[PDB]
Amino acid sequence: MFFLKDLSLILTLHPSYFGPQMNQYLREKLLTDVEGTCTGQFGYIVTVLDGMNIDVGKGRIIPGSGSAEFEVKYRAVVWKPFKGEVVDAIVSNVSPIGFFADVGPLNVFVSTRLIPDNLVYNPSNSPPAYMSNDELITKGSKVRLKVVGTRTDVNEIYAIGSIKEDFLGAI
Amino acid sequence: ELTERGKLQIEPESPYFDFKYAKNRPISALTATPDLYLRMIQAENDGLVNIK
Amino acid sequence: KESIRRDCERVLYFQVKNSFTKKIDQAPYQPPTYAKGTIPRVLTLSFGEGNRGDAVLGVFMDDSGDVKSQIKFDEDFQSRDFSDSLTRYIKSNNINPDIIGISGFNIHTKKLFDKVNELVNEERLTIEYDSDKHLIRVIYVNDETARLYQHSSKSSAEYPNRPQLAKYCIGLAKYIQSPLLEYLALDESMYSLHI
Amino acid sequence: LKHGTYEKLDEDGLIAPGVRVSGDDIIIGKTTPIPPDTEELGQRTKYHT
Amino acid sequence: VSTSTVGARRRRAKQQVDDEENATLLRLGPEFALKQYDHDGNEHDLIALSLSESRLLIREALKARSRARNGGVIDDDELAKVTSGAVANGVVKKTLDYLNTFARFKDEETCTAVDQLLHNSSDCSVLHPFEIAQLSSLGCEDVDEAITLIPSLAAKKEVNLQRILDELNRLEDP
Amino acid sequence: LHSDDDTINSETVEIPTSDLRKIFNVGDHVRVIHGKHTDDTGLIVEVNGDKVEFISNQTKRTVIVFSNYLIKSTDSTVSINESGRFELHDLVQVNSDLVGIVIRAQKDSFDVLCSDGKLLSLPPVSIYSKLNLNPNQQIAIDSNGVEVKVGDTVREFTGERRQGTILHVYRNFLFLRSREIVENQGVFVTSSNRVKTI
Amino acid sequence: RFQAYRKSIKNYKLSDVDYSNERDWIVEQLKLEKRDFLQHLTQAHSSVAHLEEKFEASVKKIVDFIAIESFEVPFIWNHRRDYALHTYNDDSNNTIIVKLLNEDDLWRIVQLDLDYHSIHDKKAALSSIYKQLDLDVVDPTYEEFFGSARTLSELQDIDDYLTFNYSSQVKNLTS
Amino acid sequence: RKAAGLIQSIQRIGSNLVNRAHLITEQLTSKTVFLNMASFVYIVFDPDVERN
Amino acid sequence: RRDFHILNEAEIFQLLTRETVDSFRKGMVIPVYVRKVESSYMSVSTQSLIAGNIQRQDILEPNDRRDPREVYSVGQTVRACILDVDYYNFKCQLSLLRQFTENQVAGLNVNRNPKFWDIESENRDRQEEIDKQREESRESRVIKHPFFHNMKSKEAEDYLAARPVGDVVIRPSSKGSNHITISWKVAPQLYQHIDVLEENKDDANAI
RNA sequence: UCCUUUUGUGCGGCCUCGA
């Protein structure tokens, strides 16, 4: 789910960049280091609002190293899944152990043990799919799944979904 | 045809350089060289190229 | 696209199957004046990486598959002492090789191969069936299975008191004696080979 | 071994009178035995004991 | 990498059950609590965003940045390529595709009407912003379906859920 | 204790350990205490009473272990030291004509990045050998003709124009470590002809 | 190995008509795959008439062995090789042996035997759906492109045709 | 799995297989499995041991 | 079964070196570690320990006349192009000439048939890649002088408009960091720009 | 073909040196 958050970043600048374009260079460095990153505490940062008018303040010279340290505060749009939440998805790959879907940048893996039995995986189908009498879910098909567990990595997030409950599956 | 990822990352070192700018290759002759078409498909799965 | 993918996968499957069939279809080495399929008596040699420090380790396997008389040579292989030790070893009454196999980790193995071949040719070390006499053959051995055998826990349990290079020599000799069973002993590791 | 030189020692491990010595040079050569490592994997004359 | 405006949180001895993340129980943790603080330390409420609001905001910010970087002189691919970083480009492309293929409201005025309906309503004055975002995002059609998908709405039975859902479907472009 | 009555939930009761059984909920990070799957972590999927099934984190496959062998550990933090025969970032010979670099290490498997970029998952036994190349062999030459040793930072000019520090050298290929490429922990393979030294 | 192959098959025992259709389908598939070999056979052995009929009979016999008698490929290759080759005497009384099939072709016949059951299940499901539709008069297009259908893609096309043109009956049975 | 069962059955009966027919008469294998495997497993025959 | 396979020259070479006879052949270019430097021959060792050799006619350029010892040193590593491979003795011959080491880039027999290869798109992409390799970095110049002002030509004229005749302003020149344009007021609404060429510059920003 | 090298104890006691 998307949210608005007030975030802060610590930026260290080498003395070779102490020029008139210091503010703009700090802005582009902040944009390159924030746009598209994935932090487990917050989720996924997609964009930073008012990216060209962010206040950077006055940098503090680190004693013994010369480099300046800047405290940059900004507001950004952040997306993070939650345990027990139902969201839409698009299937990206089909495998005997289960299917892999994509929810924006996040990839969600659903095992067969969380899939209803009537949706039997058909590897002979072109393309391979988990199909039932009235349902057929393959690559690129819209699916509604419920996030059960979230796994946090250093700079990555792994989510596990399920479709065994009602109002789930093919949509 | 090449995507931007394919436009950049398709270097001479890469195995996909053989078919970077291929055209007019008939389907009947693909079965003679399965490795070529499999490499094309694997390159497509990486998001580098598109088989049309 | 799916149809061509399936067809090409079938063709590649059959090509890989034929390549693996060419790999594993090998009989044991036939000693001269003996019927094909008879298990030979093998002696294998290898110093390892070929460095200054590395010594040559030998393993003798008879036709019954039993390892006999592993030995360690304590002299430079380019000297006369190593040649004398190898001549005494081969001409010993309790050891009667049918073939001598050599393999190693780098190009230094060529010097060992040339040294052993020259020694065998000059001294006229013939096969001892204990008439027509034939010199023992010196060949290079493909060590596809030996390098995985030397690290396998089954080999370590089989020979607890032996170093890795001794297990490499045993793997080479076993490969000479029966390539098929040596490929089978890899179990899951044979899918990682260069087929 | 140490970083100093060993060429000033004799066969018996002792330096002889009349020889010039600088700092750190070895004047008495002594060794103690050590149970050998797995170097019996094959080291013809270069396994440390 | 980035640090939140909320700090401290030192060691104690008591342990609480309102610490694990759970959408059903409406326990969003300290960093996503209902009460937040801005850079000035003033009171601030948690800002949820539906896919329509999020899509409008990301499109507005991206086109503003593209216009600014071009000296003040619509395509999703070029707009994504405006940003820097190959992994960042892939992430923004994936978000743009996800938002485009599930955009319930592609118009600014429809999104404004939806936000006004979901905010100024008397029943929605008690509704959590996460519930509002989920209702405006998932596009549910039935009260029972909404309760099953959103367990939090089960305990709030003083909400005219059915007519709000029908108004949302009406505002939704077929 | 937890119950529908609030007054009961505010009481602490001391209970002997002989009459306690752990409760494992679906979707919790748990680390295996003891068994063949020791130190495996993952998320619980199915709770069949005494037997608990969970999708692993390392092997990323479902594993069935008894509930007596599980501890709720929210993070893995598994150390791979004193295992296998391969340190992290080792240049390992996969087979006769294949080589790669260890990217991630596991208790009974490894992740290897090939010289051409393909990733492989193999058991330790299936790896042919480890290449202990000499320092003189571990030297390459950039496009300008300037020598580049291990630890020298270089930056490309063709392609995506990435930058990294040299981690290993194999033939004409340079294995580079970089800060911004988080996809393979900074390890990306380029030929020495594509880079310029800084 | 046969149990491992057939573990995924819901029902392996086909009826007589379905079994004959399976044999014909495998013969047609082998004819498609082995076109160059059949062309070489026809060109280089022009003096012998109806060799392709002998090829069809041999393929049907191999399918019969594999399905009914459950013989694996090495047993067929060793002890049933006379059904996999044809012999004749030329005008000069020359004994000539022609090898119609090899071991790889036997493995391919095993693979086609395994493959056809998915087609059979799909065709059975499509026919069942058509039965539940219960048309007053049989649709000539449906039967015309159902009798000649030999791949699951065409069965999927017929399924799409049926769910489109008779969507009202599908809705009644049940977008 | 059948191989291990066969090995265990032989080790039960006495770790020696006298004749091919004993794979059926001793109920060691079923009819079709024996029909497949009969000619691919062999028993070494020593004429000095069997004078009859 | 077939007889026991006995390795040939190519199989022995692949076994002992792990380099196939395809990836190590005539015309390829590899980095080699120099080991001996003499007046007429040079001995090098490749990465896979294959002993190389280079002759006097292949060490030095035709226009060069210096002795080979002065040009290269032991322990240095250089690029060389393979001229012959002896697969039995594990010996090879190399050449360090520019004509062999650099020009031979297209080492693969890619089928560039016009009917089967998109020649024009490849040419356009390669031209764009050269046009991107032509990109350069540049920045402004800072000079410390009382009469120096970082202004344009028109800006300097407007600045001198408010000042009487004879006042002097100094601005950076458009011809490069090595040039300085000095503008002085000749007359009301009449100014002269004079370009000054700098020699023996200590730095781009320096005078 | 040959060349190829690396590090240090602890704890007390006594006698001294400059303030």
Domain ranges of chain A: 1-82, 83-171
* I-chain residues near F136 (CB < 8 A): 33, 45
Structure tokens at D3: 């970083």
Residue F52: is it exposed, middle or buried by C-beta count within 10 angstroms (0-12/13-18/19+)? buried
Subunits adjacent to chain C (3 or more Cβ pairs under 8 Å): A, B, D, F, G, I
Q: Which residues contact A142 (CB under 8 A, 6 or more apart)?
A: A88, A89, A90, A170, A171, E101
Please report how the helices G51-64 and G103-133 are oriented relative to each other, as an axis angle in degrees rounded to 10.
80
Amino acid of residue F53: E
Q: Are the beta carbons of C138 and C120 closer than 8 angstroms?
A: yes
Structure tokens at G5: 């192959």
Strands C99-102 and C137-140: parallel
Give the Cα separation of C145 and C192 in Å (integer): 11
Which CATH entry fits the domain spanning A83-171: 3.30.1550.10, 3.40.50.300, 1.10.357.10, 2.40.50.140? 2.40.50.140
Question: Where do we find the tokens 């030397």?
Answer: C150
Rounded to whole angstroms, the distance from the CA of residue D3 to the C1' of nucleotide J10 is: 24
Nearest one of I93, I83, I80 to I50, comparing CA atoms = I93
| C-alpha G34: how far from chain center | 14
- Buried-state track E58-90, b at ≥16 Cβ within 10 A, e below 16: bbebbeebeeeeeeeeeeeeebbeebebbbbbb
Instruction: Give the single-character DSSP code of A31.
Output: H
Structure tokens at G79: 């002890």
**Quick check: F121 contacting C, CB < 8 Å?**
no
Q: Which nucleotide is nearest to C111 (CA to C1')?
A: J1
Amino acid of residue D8: K
Give the Cα separation of I40 and E55 in Å (integer): 73
- DSSP code per residue over A96-123: TTEEEEEETTEEEEEEGGGS-TTSEEES
Instruction: Give the single-character DSSP code of H16.
Output: -
In angstroms, the first-to-last Cα distance of chain I is 87
Q: Identify how many contiguous H helices and E strands chain H contains and give both numbers.
A: 3, 0
Give the Cα separation of G34 and G108 in Å (integer): 11
φ, ψ for residue G15 (rounded to 5)? -75, 175
**Quick check: F97 contacting C, CB < 8 Å?**
yes
Q: Which of A120, A124, A126 best tests the G interface by mutation, with the highest count of G CBs <10 A?
A: A124
Give the Cα separation of C2 and A124 in Å (integer): 11
The C-alpha of C14 sits at a distance from chain A's nearest C-alpha, in angstroms, of: 20
Question: Where do we find the tokens 């539940």?
Answer: G132
Give the Cα separation of G81 and F138 in Å (integer): 58
Structure tokens at I182: 């000095």
Residue E147: CB atoms within 10 A of its CB come to 17
Fold of the A1-82 domain: Dna Ligase; domain 1 (3.30.1490)
Structure tokens at I130: 């050269």
| C-alpha C25: how far from chain center | 17
**Quick check: G74 contacting H, CB < 8 Å?**
yes
Put simply, the chain F residues between 147 and 176 with a CB less than 8 A from any chain E CB are: 160
Question: Where do we find the tokens 């080491």?
Answer: I101
Name beta bridge partners: D43: C54
Query: Cis omega before residue E174 (within 30°)?
Result: no
Q: Are the beta carbons of G116 and G22 closer than 8 angstroms?
A: yes
Q: Are the beta carbons of A79 and A14 closer than 8 angstroms?
A: no
Amino acid of residue C156: S
Question: Where do we find the tokens 């002085």?
Answer: I184
The C-alpha of B47 sits at a distance from chain I's nearest C-alpha, in angstroms, of: 19
Q: Are the beta carbons of A50 and A70 closer than 8 angstroms?
A: no
Instruction: Give the single-character DSSP code of I3.
Output: P
- Buried-state track I30-41, b at ≥16 Cβ within 10 A, e below 16: bbbbbeebeeee
Q: Which residues contact I118 (CB under 8 A, 6 or more apart)?
A: B21, B22, B23
Nearest one of I35, I46, I41, I39 to I91, comparing CA atoms = I46
Q: Which of D38, D39, D41 best tests the C interface by mutation, with the highest count of C CBs <10 A?
A: D41
Write the CA distances from G26 to E71, G57, G150, I127, integer angstroms: 68, 12, 10, 54
Q: Which nucleotide is nearest to I35 (CA to C1')?
A: J1
The C-alpha of F51 sits at a distance from chain A's nearest C-alpha, in angstroms, of: 15
Please give the helix or strand (H or E) that residue A130 lies within, else none.
Answer: strand A129-131
In angstroms, the first-to-last Cα distance of chain C is 27
Q: Are the beta carbons of A145 and A171 closer than 8 angstroms?
A: no
Give the Cα separation of I129 and F158 in Å (integer): 8
Q: Are the beta carbons of I94 and I44 closer than 8 angstroms?
A: yes
Write the CA distances from E46 to A2, E31, G114, I106, integer angstroms: 11, 10, 58, 60
Give the Cα separation of B6 and A165 in Å (integer): 41
SS3 content of chain F, % helix, strand, coil (to 5): 10, 40, 50
Name beta bridge partners: C126: C135
Q: Are the beta carbons of I66 and I143 closer than 8 angstroms?
A: no
Question: Where do we find the tokens 């080790």?
Answer: H11
Q: Are the beta carbons of C159 and I31 closer than 8 angstroms?
A: no
Rounded to whole angstroms, the distance from the CA of residue I44 to the C1' of nucleotide J2 is: 16
Give the Cα separation of A63 and D31 in Å (integer): 51
Instruction: Give the single-character DSSP code of G169.
Output: H
The C-alpha of B30 sits at a distance from chain C's nearest C-alpha, in angstroms, of: 8
3-class DSSP assignment, residue A33 = helix
Write the CA distances from A35 to A26, A30, C85, integer angstroms: 14, 8, 72
* E-chain residues near F181 (CB < 8 A): 87
Strand J positions within 7 A of protein Cβ atoms: 1-3, 5-7
Residue F170: CB atoms within 10 A of its CB come to 20
Q: Are the beta carbons of I179 and I195 closer than 8 angstroms?
A: yes
Question: Breaks in chain H, named by the residue before each, with C–N above 2.5 Å?
Answer: none
Question: Where do we find the tokens 């009819």?
Answer: H31
Structure tokens at C51: 């460095």
What residues approach strand J to within 7 A at the CB? C 52; D 1-4; I 35-36
CATH code, residues E49-174: 1.20.1250.40
- DSSP code per residue over I132-195: HHT-----------TTB----HHHHHHHHHSS-TT-EEEEE-TT-TTEEEEEEEEETTEEEEEE
Give the Cα separation of F109 and F88 in Å (integer): 12
Q: Which residues contact G77 (CB under 8 A, 6 or more apart)?
A: G84, G103, G106
Give the Cα separation of E4 and A8 in Å (integer): 6
3-class DSSP assignment, residue E87 = helix
Give the Cα separation of F20 and F27 in Å (integer): 22
φ, ψ for residue A48 (rounded to 5)? -115, 125
Put simply, the chain D residues between 12 and 41 with a CB less than 8 A from any chain C CB are: 38, 40-41
Put simply, the chain F residues between 147 and 166 with a CB less than 8 A from any chain I CB are: 147, 157-158
**Quick check: I45 contacting C, CB < 8 Å?**
no
Instruction: Give the single-character DSSP code of A32.
Output: H
Q: What angle do CA A88, A90, A92 make, to 5 degrees?
A: 150
Nearest one of A68, A74, A120 to A99, comparing CA atoms = A120
Across the beta sheet with C42-46, the strand order is: C67-72, C57-61, C42-46, C99-102, C137-140
Structure tokens at E103: 């955009």
Give the Cα separation of F154 and F171 in Å (integer): 17
Chains E and A touch (3+ CB pairs under 8 A): yes
Q: Which residues contact C138 (CB under 8 A, 6 or more apart)?
A: C99, C100, C101, C102, C113, C116, C117, C120
Amino acid of residue F80: I
Rounded to whole angstroms, the distance from the CA of residue D48 to the C1' of nucleotide J3 is: 20
Give the Cα separation of B24 and I118 in Å (integer): 10
Answer yes or no: do B38 and C4 touch at CB < 8 A.
no
Instruction: Give the single-character DSSP code of I5.
Output: P
Q: Are the beta carbons of C23 and C195 closer than 8 angstroms?
A: yes
φ, ψ for residue C179 (rounded to 5)? -60, -40
Write the CA distances from G120 to A96, A127, G7, G150, integer angstroms: 21, 18, 16, 10
Instruction: Give the single-character DSSP code of G68.
Output: I
- DSSP code per residue over chain C: -HHHHHHHHHHHHHHHHHHHHHHH--PPP--TTS-TTPPPPEEEEE-SS--SSBPPEEEEE-TTS-EEEEEE--S-TTSHHHHHHHHHHHT-TT---SEEEE--SSTTHHHHHHHHHHHHHHHT-B--------BPEEEE---TTHHHHTT-HHHHHH-TTS-HHHHHHHHHHHHHH-HHHHHHTTGGGGGSS--
Q: Which residues contact C63 (CB under 8 A, 6 or more apart)?
A: C38, C39, C40, C41
Nearest one of A84, A91, A1 to A44, comparing CA atoms = A1
Q: Are the beta carbons of F24 and F52 closer than 8 angstroms?
A: yes
Q: Which nucleotide is nearest to D5 (CA to C1')?
A: J5
| C-alpha I2: how far from chain center | 55
In angstroms, the first-to-last Cα distance of chain H is 37
For chain E, which residues make up each domain, given as ranges? Answer: 1-48, 49-174
Answer yes or no: do C76 and D44 touch at CB < 8 A.
yes
Q: What is the resolution of this structure in A?
A: 4.3
Question: Where do we find the tokens 């988080």?
Answer: F182
Give the Cα separation of C169 and C187 in Å (integer): 20
Answer yes or no: do F159 and B14 touch at CB < 8 A.
no
3-class DSSP assignment, residue B45 = helix
Q: Are the beta carbons of I29 and C86 closer than 8 angstroms?
A: no
Q: Are the beta carbons of F160 and B9 closer than 8 angstroms?
A: yes
